[PDB]
Design a protein around this nucleic acid. Structure first.
Ligand SMILES: [Mg+2]
Ligand SMILES: [Mg+2]
Ligand SMILES: [Mg+2]
Ligand SMILES: [Mg+2]
Ligand SMILES: [Mg+2]
Ligand SMILES: [Mg+2]
Ligand SMILES: [Mg+2]
Ligand SMILES: [Mg+2]
Ligand SMILES: [Mg+2]
Ligand SMILES: [Mg+2]
Ligand SMILES: [Mg+2]
Ligand SMILES: [Mg+2]
Ligand SMILES: [Mg+2]
Ligand SMILES: [Mg+2]
Ligand SMILES: [Mg+2]
Ligand SMILES: [Mg+2]
Ligand SMILES: [Mg+2]
Ligand SMILES: [Mg+2]
Ligand SMILES: [Mg+2]
Ligand SMILES: [Mg+2]
Ligand SMILES: [Mg+2]
Ligand SMILES: [Mg+2]
Ligand SMILES: [Mg+2]
Ligand SMILES: [Mg+2]
Ligand SMILES: [Mg+2]
Ligand SMILES: [Mg+2]
Ligand SMILES: [Mg+2]
Ligand SMILES: [Mg+2]
Ligand SMILES: [Mg+2]
Ligand SMILES: [Mg+2]
Ligand SMILES: [Zn+2]
Lengths: 152, 48, 108, 45
RNA sequence: GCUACCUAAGAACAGCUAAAAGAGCACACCCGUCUAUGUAGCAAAAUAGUGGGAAGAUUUAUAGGUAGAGGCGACAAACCUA
RNA sequence: CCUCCGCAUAAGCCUGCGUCAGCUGACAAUUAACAGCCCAAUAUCUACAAUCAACCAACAAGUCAUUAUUACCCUCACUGUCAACCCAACACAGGCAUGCUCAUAAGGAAAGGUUAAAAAAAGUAAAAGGAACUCGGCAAAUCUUACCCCGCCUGUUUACCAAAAACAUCACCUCUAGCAUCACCAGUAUUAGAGGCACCGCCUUCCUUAAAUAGGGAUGGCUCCACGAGGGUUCAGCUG
RNA sequence: ACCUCGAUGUUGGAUCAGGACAUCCCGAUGGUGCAGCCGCUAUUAAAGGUUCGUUUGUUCAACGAUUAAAGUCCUACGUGAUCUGAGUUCAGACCGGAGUAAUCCAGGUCGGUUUCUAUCUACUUUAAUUCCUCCCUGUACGAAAGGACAAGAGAAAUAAGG
């Protein structure tokens, strides 16, 4: 029974899971885009968002500095986290990460995911775009909207 | 007021920079050694 | 425990040709509008994603050349500029990564 | 625990199953003769 | 070339306590009390923990010797290439 | 993140992750100072350990030496030098001597991806109780008393179901032997061999539990000082 | 001495229990040397239940404390491809005895390897019971001592389901 259990069991245990997520998150902070098994990316997305929040908390905050020091194995990223990522998302309140599925890894056919930080300089991903508003169905729904607006 | 941790390689990782940092740790022990006897012992103990 | 009798080919066929074992037909396959190669509805196009990964690899090689050494992550934003492009007003105060090819159409 | 009864050592190998020892006694000479009659490529160890 | 015993000439035994010990605690090392796993196994006898000895009748590398109505044996009818 | 290790020598194997192009073929490589490979005779020398060798201490008495003559001008040959390696039918969780490193500067990766069903293995934590489990406190947790049976003790044994009360053991006892050039022994009755036994020493119904088929007490034979992964009983604590 | 000696030791215990009723308790009745309470005996009833400890392999038994009761059996003396091996069974060794000895023992004791990845069958989600307390009531019954039913209420315990 695992009712309400929200954390995946990864690696060799709790500490190993934390370290795996830490390495993935350090790579994410360094490169602004990471490919990894879908489950691991899903687990690490929350920690990525939490790091962005801690960076927003400020460079001078001792708790935020300690959290960044722990979670960024390469210490050159801490200035990056506090001076690039957090200022970039200062306007936003959430959704700093974009996660998408990727074709299964050729090696072991694992479910792969690409996770990036929004607003990075890298080329945009082939995001899924909804159907154009000029399609037949969308135009019919536009007619519905206009008629409802006029009537009421 | 912002105390960024030093930008150095990790001591325990498996990398060229980590190996260099461990070598630096060894050389730091050599430097901290007081007696010339201890310095020579540390410098020549490992036989290769 | 060991088997008590050889299982006949009829029984074996009944077992291993069952629908529960047959490979299910996928109905979420579609054609990518951008390049026309096949993709799944919820998965990114393999061809387009390979394009993006290769361009990202080139940009990252340029970034590594610019940084020149481990632990040299900049404290300032990064902007990728291709041949025939000049930093804009907002591109000021951001490290520039130069690419020798022209601006890709999908890149913006 | 068992299986590795062979602890190789060329000194023992030659002193126990060598050409000199086989020729040392009439029985070993007959051993070599039997190997030669059978056509063994390796007459002595 | 395993193993039983022996011959020649070698090697090992941290640290502490006691002092000159077939002494005590305890590494390396040797062994294999009990438990669990394993039982076509990692293994044709092992793994983990626990445990006995660990300066001695100790452990051990090298070469040699004793051969089957025999050898060797601190006798377990033990070992002498599973 | 791990470090059992690691680097060399020895032993063993013998080209066994060097390059190239298709595991296979070709090409390349280990360069002696290190090590091995020695000595002209004839006689003749050599009692006094080692232990920091100095006090001291011994016993099991121990690893290191030349001389006197006669001969004697050619000097640097040969061989090992690689590796991810050997013995276990295997890229085997086993076996493998030595010197340094005593945790490393060297060497490595427990997780193919996902889920987190049962059963199973290992581990951590547990309300109150604390052996009521059980053949037995096996295991786990703690760091714990006292006493019996056996064996004096250290050791040895059925390699692979028994490590013990069995074998051995100092000590004691019995029997045999008056002696040299291959053991006994280069010894001689205080010696040697065969054997027994086992140090030494000495002589001649009640208690425990509430409950107890458990435990303890009212020449040989006694005698438990010490010791024991031996077999029983037990206070207290401890704990799934 | 009829099947099985061309890999099933056995006894206890653990686990799960299926079944019979010749019923230990709970239910309904007849008789009684049944005034009442205790009981004894017989008919009917197998839905439910039928304890934990000390010694000891031990089933059993004795003992301690309980219970409404601590039922008799069958199920390969149920079940060991689910577990244990405590007695018992091989190799070791003792005491006692037999034997010239090798050895032996229905005796006592210390130790002693318990494999299997499930092919087939079968199967894997099917309205509770009892004790105690109070009331009736220290009422009926009885001379007293004792002491009831039925019905009702309250408390628990177990079992099932959450
Ligand atoms: Mg996992
Ligand atoms: Mg050997
Ligand atoms: Mg010592
Ligand atoms: Mg000692
Ligand atoms: Mg011996
Ligand atoms: Mg015997
Ligand atoms: Mg015998
Ligand atoms: Mg054999
Ligand atoms: Mg791995
Ligand atoms: Mg897996
Ligand atoms: Mg508890
Ligand atoms: Mg107790
Ligand atoms: Mg019991
Ligand atoms: Mg008990
Ligand atoms: Mg124990
Ligand atoms: Mg003894
Ligand atoms: Mg002993
Ligand atoms: Mg044995
Ligand atoms: Mg042995
Ligand atoms: Mg044993
Ligand atoms: Mg008891
Ligand atoms: Mg007949
Ligand atoms: Mg009846
Ligand atoms: Mg019967
Ligand atoms: Mg038994
Ligand atoms: Mg008996
Ligand atoms: Mg027994
Ligand atoms: Mg034992
Ligand atoms: Mg079994
Ligand atoms: Mg099974
Ligand atoms: Zn596409």
């Amino acid at each position: 029974i695992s009712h309400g259990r929200v954390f995946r069991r990864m690696g060799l245990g709790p500490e190993s899971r934390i370290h795996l997520l830490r390495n993935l998150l350090t790579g994410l902070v360094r490169h602004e885009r990471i490919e990894a098994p879908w489950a691991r990316v899903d687990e690490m997305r929350g920690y990525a968002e939490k790091l962005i929040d801690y960076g927003k908390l400020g460079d001078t905050n001792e708790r935020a500095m300690r959290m960044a020091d722990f979670w960024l194995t390469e210490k050159d990223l801490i200035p990056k986290l506090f001076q690039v990522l957090a200022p970039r998302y200062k306007d936003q309140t959430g959704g700093y990460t974009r996660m998408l599925q990727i074709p299964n890894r050729s090696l072991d056919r694992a479910k792969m995911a690409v996770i990036e930080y929004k607003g990075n300089c890298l080329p945009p991903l082939p995001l899924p775009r909804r159907d154009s508003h000029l399609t037949l169905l969308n135009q019919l729904l536009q007619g519905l909207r206009q008629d409802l607006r006029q009537s009421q | 007021v912002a105390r960024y941790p030093p930008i150095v390689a990790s001591m325990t990782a498996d990398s060229k920079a980590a190996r260099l940092r461990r070598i630096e740790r060894w050389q730091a022990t050599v430097h901290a050694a007081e007696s010339v006897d201890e310095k020579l012992r540390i410098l020549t103990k490992m036989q290769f | 425990a060991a088997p008590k009798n050889r299982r006949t080919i009829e029984v074996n066929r009944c077992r291993r040709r069952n629908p529960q074992k047959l490979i299910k037909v996928k109905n979420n396959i579609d054609v990518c509008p951008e390049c026309g190669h096949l993709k799944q509805k919820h998965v990114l196009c393999a061809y387009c994603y390979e394009k993006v990964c290769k361009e990202t690899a080139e940009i990252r090689r340029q970034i590594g050349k610019q940084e020149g050494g481990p632990f040299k992550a900049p404290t300032i934003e990064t902007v990728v500029l291709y041949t025939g492009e000049t930093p804009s007003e907002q591109d000021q105060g951001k490290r520039i990564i130069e690419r020798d090819r022209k601006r890709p159409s999908w890149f913006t | 625990a068992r299986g590795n009864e062979y602890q190789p050592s060329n000194i023992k190998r030659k002193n126990k199953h060598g050409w000199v020892r086989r020729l040392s006694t009439p029985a070993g000479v007959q051993v070599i003769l039997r190997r030669m009659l059978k056509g063994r490529k390796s007459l002595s160890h």
